[PDB]
Amino acid sequence: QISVRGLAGVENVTELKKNFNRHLHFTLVKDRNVATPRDYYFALAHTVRDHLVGRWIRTQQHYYEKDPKRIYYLSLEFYMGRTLQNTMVNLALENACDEATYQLGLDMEELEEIEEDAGLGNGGLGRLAACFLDSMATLGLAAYGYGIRYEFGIFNQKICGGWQMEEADDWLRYGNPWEKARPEFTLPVHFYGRVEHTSQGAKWVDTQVVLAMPYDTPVPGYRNNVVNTMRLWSAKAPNDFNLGYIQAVLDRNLAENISRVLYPNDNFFEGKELRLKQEYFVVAATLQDIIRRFKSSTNFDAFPDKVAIQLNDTHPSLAIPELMRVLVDLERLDWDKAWEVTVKTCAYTNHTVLPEALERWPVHLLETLLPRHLQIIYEINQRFLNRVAAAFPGDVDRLRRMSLVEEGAVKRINMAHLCIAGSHAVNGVARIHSEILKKTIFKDFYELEPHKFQNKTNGITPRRWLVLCNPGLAEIIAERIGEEYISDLDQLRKLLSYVDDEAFIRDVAKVKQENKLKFAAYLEREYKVHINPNSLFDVQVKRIHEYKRQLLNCLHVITLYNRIKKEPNKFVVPRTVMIGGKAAPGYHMAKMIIKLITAIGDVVNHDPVVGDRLRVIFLENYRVSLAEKVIPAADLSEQISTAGTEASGTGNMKFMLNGALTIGTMDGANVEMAEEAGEENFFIFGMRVEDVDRLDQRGYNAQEYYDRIPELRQIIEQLSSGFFSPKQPDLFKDIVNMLMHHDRFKVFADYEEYVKCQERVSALYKNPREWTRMVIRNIATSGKFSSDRTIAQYAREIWGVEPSRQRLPA
Amino acid sequence: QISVRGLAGVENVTELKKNFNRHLHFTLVKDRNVATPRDYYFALAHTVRDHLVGRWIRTQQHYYEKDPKRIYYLSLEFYMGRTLQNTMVNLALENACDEATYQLGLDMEELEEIEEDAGLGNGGLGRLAACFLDSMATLGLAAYGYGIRYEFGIFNQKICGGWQMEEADDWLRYGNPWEKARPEFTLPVHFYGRVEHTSQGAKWVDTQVVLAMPYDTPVPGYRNNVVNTMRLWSAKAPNDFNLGYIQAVLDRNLAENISRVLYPNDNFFEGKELRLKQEYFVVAATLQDIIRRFKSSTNFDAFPDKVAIQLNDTHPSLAIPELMRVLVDLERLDWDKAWEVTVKTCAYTNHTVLPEALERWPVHLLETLLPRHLQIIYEINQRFLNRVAAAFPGDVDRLRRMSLVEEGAVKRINMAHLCIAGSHAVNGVARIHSEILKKTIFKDFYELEPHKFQNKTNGITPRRWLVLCNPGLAEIIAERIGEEYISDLDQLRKLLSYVDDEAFIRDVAKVKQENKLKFAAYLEREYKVHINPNSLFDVQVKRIHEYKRQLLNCLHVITLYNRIKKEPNKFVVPRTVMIGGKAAPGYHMAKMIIKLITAIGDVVNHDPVVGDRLRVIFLENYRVSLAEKVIPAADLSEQISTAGTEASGTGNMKFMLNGALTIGTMDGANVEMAEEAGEENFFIFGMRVEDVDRLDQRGYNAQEYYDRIPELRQIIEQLSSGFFSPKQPDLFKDIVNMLMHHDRFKVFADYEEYVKCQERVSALYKNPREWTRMVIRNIATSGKFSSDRTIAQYAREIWGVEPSRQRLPA
Ligand SMILES: CCCCCc1cc2cn([C@@H]3O[C@H](CO)[C@@H](O)[C@H](O)[C@H]3O)c(=O)nc2o1
Ligand SMILES: CCCCCc1cc2cn([C@@H]3O[C@H](CO)[C@@H](O)[C@H](O)[C@H]3O)c(=O)nc2o1
């Protein structure tokens, strides 16, 4: 049908068809009179997976003979979403399968909707890992994703009376065709025990054994025939385990609980044992697998020339003392040499500065669970602090601030400090985030080893985030400048000469118009809710957090409402405000925000006076596959975190690529996006990082804003008095209370500038042509935000390998 | 190679080869440089399963249009063993796959050894169900096996210092190619709750829901292209289940524990909740599935003309009040009519008279767990007792004996009584067992409804128990009389005219000689133990029970030893005594017997004087696939239960079919085997049922035997004094104590007659030719003991359907 989707060969269409019928019959054991769409989804998924394997096997083979340096991406999160379309796209099968399935009298699009998301992540950090995997394959790196195969991923969110209900994501219920169990590479992981000292050195003994079984999932490069591996570990109990009899067998579940469920906070840090066991589990299994692969090439000097280990936040920080443990206790290298090898292997990526997000494990936990790792850690600390002392003699304060060991009512290990000490590179995820790292929380460490600190601004993959979710726009781009930009997104910069082209302007607008219409229909079919598609689509999607300030959005929305009710017969640019995201289950405030959002909807969507001029929708169950639908349909992208809190953001980049304009603060990667497009083509408002520090150091008094802004005063009053909760008048007292007395995120301080900036957005929207020309300037300068750029920078500046765009043979 | 194994076509061999390589590559994702035999086993298993499916689908289709009466075989046990060879055999692919795998440079026999047993049963009752399934398919009945898919089957037995250790049977670890998950037919099962009464009748409410997910496994008929289904249910928790968050997800395991593990007693009855939940679980899911199938043909009058439900012991007895519950509470038929439908649907098979094996559920358990089923049961009891009262007016004793409700310190429901009241036929499993039923435990019930009581002597399938495990003998039979006997085992009777044929005599002996040599090699390779293959192979294999009297065997073995040590220079016919079987984990005595057996081995196998004249081996991990090896290699089959305790036995039949002679008591099916072969061709010794009753009614005093038999006195003394346990002299005090003061099974009373009969066996063995002629008379009269006969009798006399031997089209 459309050309970016590949060739529909006459042979290809014919083979696809017989293979689809083979799987229906042999694999699924159905015939065409009993098959449901689920069966049809499966036969198609099996048919496409068939095309992967030859490549998968050939790619693993290449790495064996070439023996290149290997990259291990360690993460507790992989937010993959659906696999089928992405696979078709990277293999250039999309059009063929469309044809092939059409002639069988099926609608492929309807089949795609049947696939469960692999929701093995919470948000940005999980999804980065997924983009990175796609980019790594596409750039021909010999790279492995390693994580945990959670039986249950991020919970499905239901709204019941405006409240979030959590229910379990049973994503494997119907099976998962993409994975291949490999019970033959199962590995022991040890816990508890104690440490004995010999003549021969330390020994870890009387441990409980949990087995780790890997599952391999193919990660196909973009049209280069590279297929890399994502290996995910599953917990199994051993057979003699506990081994009255019945109970012993049932208790096998204690061991297997390790891989049962993904922890769903991205707000906070909970010092729960189960979580630490998951962290140790992925790191022990992964390192033995790494070492094993290294042995099949005594000599650990070359180890850093063959192995690179990237740590995605501190979650797998135990890789460091675990690598030491192996090298020292098992291979019997001396400390200094093992330590050299470890630092040259490991590198660390930080994703936040919020102090409550930092991992600080209680020492009593590590002592019971990992007694040897604590020994190694104390030894790491001691030797590190002697370097500190020697470089800053007499500075006893530096020494307490820099310790990997925090004193206090309970001793904790600061995991971030561990990663800096034992890594050769530490990076932030957007330029301002990396500066803040150097100037505030890791200032001491930076003064000690400035060479360790780097920046790697995040990106998103344009395969999923443009070609896949937005074929219309990818096609009209490709009409003008070719297809080469799909793996070289810098070429989008050539759309700049199309800024005054009348045909392009019309086409860009037409695609947006189509995505809006299609999404509005998705809204009626799947959730029975009813929106004007001529309105501006104002969307905020992302996890619910105080620092992301969905509340600031709420205050605007309430203001628009109030101004409509004051002069109801005046013209306003109509808007559909859509807000979505999950709250971590125990994050009370986050759950209150979701309730407010639906409560505003109950009032605004049912005022006869408001008409279809304002609508407030809370988008239920935000997740990767919902983002693929809502992002292309958006006009306004809301990125309104308080300056200095959002490390990078990546949602922001998805929207830029897809033809929304951005209203946002100079936070995170927003800064670089505006720098790339021109501040004129951006809606920037509010405090800069500096303004926030000025406010802090004199004190944030929220009362001041309440006193000078009558529009604001009114809103707080409606909140307090029961306007939005007529049955429980005091429902929102916590929010009003927080906003007034202990807002760490200064919602009121940005309110005035935000509302004004919002009026400027409405003003540009009244002029369709000028709105679209601005869109074009945005879409055209989005090239920097490809994860191909990001990964190429990691590769050269941290891992020491060279990207390759060259096809492997089919 | 050999002709019973089918054609090696040139096309067949060629297709098998490409399909094997397709699965290796596409399904297993290996290539020939990394594949292990496990991978090779799998590609072959996938290749053979391919040949099933077309037939599986076509067979289900036939039943849809023909709409015949359907048989549901309900059992908590299916002791299947390996599937691959059996599948090849029934499909006539054996020789082709042998050829096909030979040309790939693989040894198929070595690949077969990789398949795990499906050990979803304990012993005879589980394995009967499996034979029955094969026979049902072979006779073209539209029959379904229904059970539970246990995650862990019967434990693997390890001997450690002569003691049984149990370890978990993780049979699904590497996957199971034979099954097809069907998450689309998942069904709710309810527990707990309470009963509300309406104007509209009873309602069961506030229940916990556990979902039951079915797995379908193909059951292929013998060369008739019929493929029937074994459906096994798996427990899954619902998604809103319990639904702080983490714990709620982890607790999903409480619900799923229902299908986690098979209970391993066949001795006793344990009134454990988990077990009752398994019983309810299989019965609720199965009946809804049955009813659903019946609805796709309001009118439940035809229900008994369309549905037959066979209950394998009382384990699924709740089918009865569950069928009532559905019919009365959900479909709103009146009681009398539902009850009529239920009785005409259900039939019951009893497998023992031992009072401690009988299910008697505590009323407090049923009240909490299944409150409505208890109501139905009380109503069943009441209406039943009015029939009793009316037929035997004034007999208040009959009334207490017949009640489904037993009074006593705790009230119990007697599940056997339930099955008789609510079934149109009750059967025993061998002729003497059925008489005993009528004369003792169900005498009252028989007087009430004599027409309900029938006999169905057990059988074994000659596909697994001859063609598969003993190709040598099947071939030499087939040389003389054709292949038709494989599904008409009565034809073996024609071997009677070959009794004086010198060539046959030589061939029968040669095959036995080959199986012995091959098994002796299996003994050295896999368990490093070392046996003279010219000895008589004396084997007792079966679960360890006091009533099966492995102890009586021990006393013989100790006697042979003692006589050798008295006159060491005299000739004795050398013997290898082999004894194997598992003990239920909490059955202390059973575990003591295993220890004695190995302890006798520690003495006898290391006496220089004994030489290779006596050897005692305990065969570890007895299970279906070990039986396939040891049975064909045996000379003497030991079936030495006390008269009146072994309901039928089926091991006994396997040995008869495979050329062992039988030493046994007139117990169970032994009686009919000797009746078929002639008592002259059998080694019968000991008390008859009648003799046991005479001994009881005057009192069994074991001291009497100890006083008059000095050979016996000696053994007890060696036992008591530490002869067989020099380090713990008092180790066996429990056994000596039981034997002397409270032997319920009268081991001493049969000792004299057994030892004498053993001398007669040794005497015949000195004359090879006459031994073999007797073997031939045994093998030749084994036809009655085919499960084809048995199932044909069930079909005509209980289910009311006609067997069909006619091929379905390929
Ligand atoms: C037990 C630990 C629980 C809390 C730790 C945590 C930090 C954090 C950061 N980010 C995002 O990581 C994204 C990828 O770098 C980035 O774009 C976003 O700015 C950043 O907020 C994220 O998505 N989730 C994370 O959870
Ligand atoms: C919770 C309940 C636990 C104990 C109930 C039980 C009875 C019983 C009978 N049989 C055999 O069933 C075989 C099949 O009929 C038969 O040949 C054997 O003679 C008979 O002993 C068996 O194998 N296992 C059974 O367990």
PDB file of N, CA and C in Angstrom, chain A residues 135-166:
ATOM      1  N   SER A 135      18.666   0.306  18.680  1.00  0.00           N
ATOM      2  CA  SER A 135      19.777   1.053  18.106  1.00  0.00           C
ATOM      3  C   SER A 135      21.082   0.271  18.059  1.00  0.00           C
ATOM      4  N   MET A 136      21.318  -0.562  19.055  1.00  0.00           N
ATOM      5  CA  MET A 136      22.545  -1.345  19.098  1.00  0.00           C
ATOM      6  C   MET A 136      22.624  -2.393  17.979  1.00  0.00           C
ATOM      7  N   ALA A 137      21.488  -2.969  17.654  1.00  0.00           N
ATOM      8  CA  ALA A 137      21.385  -3.997  16.662  1.00  0.00           C
ATOM      9  C   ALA A 137      21.569  -3.307  15.318  1.00  0.00           C
ATOM     10  N   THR A 138      20.951  -2.147  15.205  1.00  0.00           N
ATOM     11  CA  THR A 138      20.941  -1.407  13.976  1.00  0.00           C
ATOM     12  C   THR A 138      22.353  -0.931  13.649  1.00  0.00           C
ATOM     13  N   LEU A 139      23.212  -0.741  14.656  1.00  0.00           N
ATOM     14  CA  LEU A 139      24.544  -0.212  14.412  1.00  0.00           C
ATOM     15  C   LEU A 139      25.543  -1.315  14.520  1.00  0.00           C
ATOM     16  N   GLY A 140      25.073  -2.563  14.494  1.00  0.00           N
ATOM     17  CA  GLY A 140      25.962  -3.723  14.355  1.00  0.00           C
ATOM     18  C   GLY A 140      26.887  -3.964  15.524  1.00  0.00           C
ATOM     19  N   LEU A 141      26.522  -3.500  16.715  1.00  0.00           N
ATOM     20  CA  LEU A 141      27.307  -3.788  17.885  1.00  0.00           C
ATOM     21  C   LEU A 141      27.016  -5.214  18.414  1.00  0.00           C
ATOM     22  N   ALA A 142      28.036  -5.879  18.953  1.00  0.00           N
ATOM     23  CA  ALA A 142      27.846  -7.222  19.468  1.00  0.00           C
ATOM     24  C   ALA A 142      27.388  -7.064  20.914  1.00  0.00           C
ATOM     25  N   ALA A 143      26.088  -6.875  21.089  1.00  0.00           N
ATOM     26  CA  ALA A 143      25.562  -6.365  22.323  1.00  0.00           C
ATOM     27  C   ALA A 143      24.454  -7.272  22.797  1.00  0.00           C
ATOM     28  N   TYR A 144      24.379  -7.419  24.108  1.00  0.00           N
ATOM     29  CA  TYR A 144      23.441  -8.302  24.788  1.00  0.00           C
ATOM     30  C   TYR A 144      22.650  -7.520  25.830  1.00  0.00           C
ATOM     31  N   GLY A 145      21.335  -7.627  25.797  1.00  0.00           N
ATOM     32  CA  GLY A 145      20.490  -7.109  26.865  1.00  0.00           C
ATOM     33  C   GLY A 145      20.346  -8.178  27.931  1.00  0.00           C
ATOM     34  N   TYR A 146      20.577  -7.826  29.170  1.00  0.00           N
ATOM     35  CA  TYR A 146      20.373  -8.776  30.250  1.00  0.00           C
ATOM     36  C   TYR A 146      19.460  -8.240  31.322  1.00  0.00           C
ATOM     37  N   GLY A 147      18.449  -9.032  31.681  1.00  0.00           N
ATOM     38  CA  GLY A 147      17.483  -8.649  32.707  1.00  0.00           C
ATOM     39  C   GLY A 147      16.802  -9.849  33.308  1.00  0.00           C
ATOM     40  N   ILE A 148      15.609  -9.610  33.861  1.00  0.00           N
ATOM     41  CA  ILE A 148      14.853 -10.617  34.582  1.00  0.00           C
ATOM     42  C   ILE A 148      13.596 -10.850  33.805  1.00  0.00           C
ATOM     43  N   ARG A 149      13.154 -12.102  33.666  1.00  0.00           N
ATOM     44  CA  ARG A 149      11.872 -12.368  32.950  1.00  0.00           C
ATOM     45  C   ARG A 149      10.741 -12.322  33.990  1.00  0.00           C
ATOM     46  N   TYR A 150      10.183 -11.144  34.263  1.00  0.00           N
ATOM     47  CA  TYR A 150       9.154 -11.122  35.296  1.00  0.00           C
ATOM     48  C   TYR A 150       7.923 -11.831  34.771  1.00  0.00           C
ATOM     49  N   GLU A 151       7.335 -12.631  35.636  1.00  0.00           N
ATOM     50  CA  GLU A 151       6.094 -13.272  35.310  1.00  0.00           C
ATOM     51  C   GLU A 151       4.993 -12.225  35.192  1.00  0.00           C
ATOM     52  N   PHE A 152       5.025 -11.186  36.043  1.00  0.00           N
ATOM     53  CA  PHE A 152       4.072 -10.086  35.922  1.00  0.00           C
ATOM     54  C   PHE A 152       4.774  -8.745  35.808  1.00  0.00           C
ATOM     55  N   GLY A 153       4.475  -8.006  34.760  1.00  0.00           N
ATOM     56  CA  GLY A 153       5.139  -6.738  34.454  1.00  0.00           C
ATOM     57  C   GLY A 153       4.379  -5.625  35.144  1.00  0.00           C
ATOM     58  N   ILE A 154       4.437  -4.436  34.569  1.00  0.00           N
ATOM     59  CA  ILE A 154       3.724  -3.319  35.177  1.00  0.00           C
ATOM     60  C   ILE A 154       2.215  -3.645  35.233  1.00  0.00           C
ATOM     61  N   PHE A 155       1.573  -3.410  36.364  1.00  0.00           N
ATOM     62  CA  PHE A 155       0.145  -3.653  36.501  1.00  0.00           C
ATOM     63  C   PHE A 155      -0.736  -2.945  35.437  1.00  0.00           C
ATOM     64  N   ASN A 156      -1.848  -3.574  35.081  1.00  0.00           N
ATOM     65  CA  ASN A 156      -2.828  -2.865  34.318  1.00  0.00           C
ATOM     66  C   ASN A 156      -3.613  -1.944  35.225  1.00  0.00           C
ATOM     67  N   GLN A 157      -3.769  -0.687  34.803  1.00  0.00           N
ATOM     68  CA  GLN A 157      -4.506   0.353  35.534  1.00  0.00           C
ATOM     69  C   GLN A 157      -6.000   0.388  35.110  1.00  0.00           C
ATOM     70  N   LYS A 158      -6.896   0.255  36.090  1.00  0.00           N
ATOM     71  CA  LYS A 158      -8.313   0.488  35.859  1.00  0.00           C
ATOM     72  C   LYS A 158      -8.724   1.693  36.676  1.00  0.00           C
ATOM     73  N   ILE A 159      -9.538   2.565  36.092  1.00  0.00           N
ATOM     74  CA  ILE A 159     -10.225   3.602  36.860  1.00  0.00           C
ATOM     75  C   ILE A 159     -11.592   3.091  37.363  1.00  0.00           C
ATOM     76  N   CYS A 160     -11.822   3.168  38.673  1.00  0.00           N
ATOM     77  CA  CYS A 160     -13.116   2.802  39.273  1.00  0.00           C
ATOM     78  C   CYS A 160     -13.474   3.984  40.138  1.00  0.00           C
ATOM     79  N   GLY A 161     -14.560   4.650  39.741  1.00  0.00           N
ATOM     80  CA  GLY A 161     -15.060   5.865  40.372  1.00  0.00           C
ATOM     81  C   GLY A 161     -13.986   6.919  40.446  1.00  0.00           C
ATOM     82  N   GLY A 162     -13.237   7.052  39.349  1.00  0.00           N
ATOM     83  CA  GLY A 162     -12.089   7.952  39.362  1.00  0.00           C
ATOM     84  C   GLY A 162     -10.805   7.530  40.092  1.00  0.00           C
ATOM     85  N   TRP A 163     -10.815   6.399  40.810  1.00  0.00           N
ATOM     86  CA  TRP A 163      -9.619   5.874  41.509  1.00  0.00           C
ATOM     87  C   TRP A 163      -8.891   4.802  40.693  1.00  0.00           C
ATOM     88  N   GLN A 164      -7.566   4.811  40.705  1.00  0.00           N
ATOM     89  CA  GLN A 164      -6.746   3.771  40.083  1.00  0.00           C
ATOM     90  C   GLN A 164      -6.951   2.434  40.808  1.00  0.00           C
ATOM     91  N   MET A 165      -7.311   1.380  40.093  1.00  0.00           N
ATOM     92  CA  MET A 165      -7.197   0.032  40.655  1.00  0.00           C
ATOM     93  C   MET A 165      -6.041  -0.686  39.934  1.00  0.00           C
ATOM     94  N   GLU A 166      -5.252  -1.464  40.662  1.00  0.00           N
ATOM     95  CA  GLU A 166      -4.186  -2.229  40.041  1.00  0.00           C
ATOM     96  C   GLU A 166      -4.673  -3.645  39.816  1.00  0.00           C
TER      97      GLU A 166
END
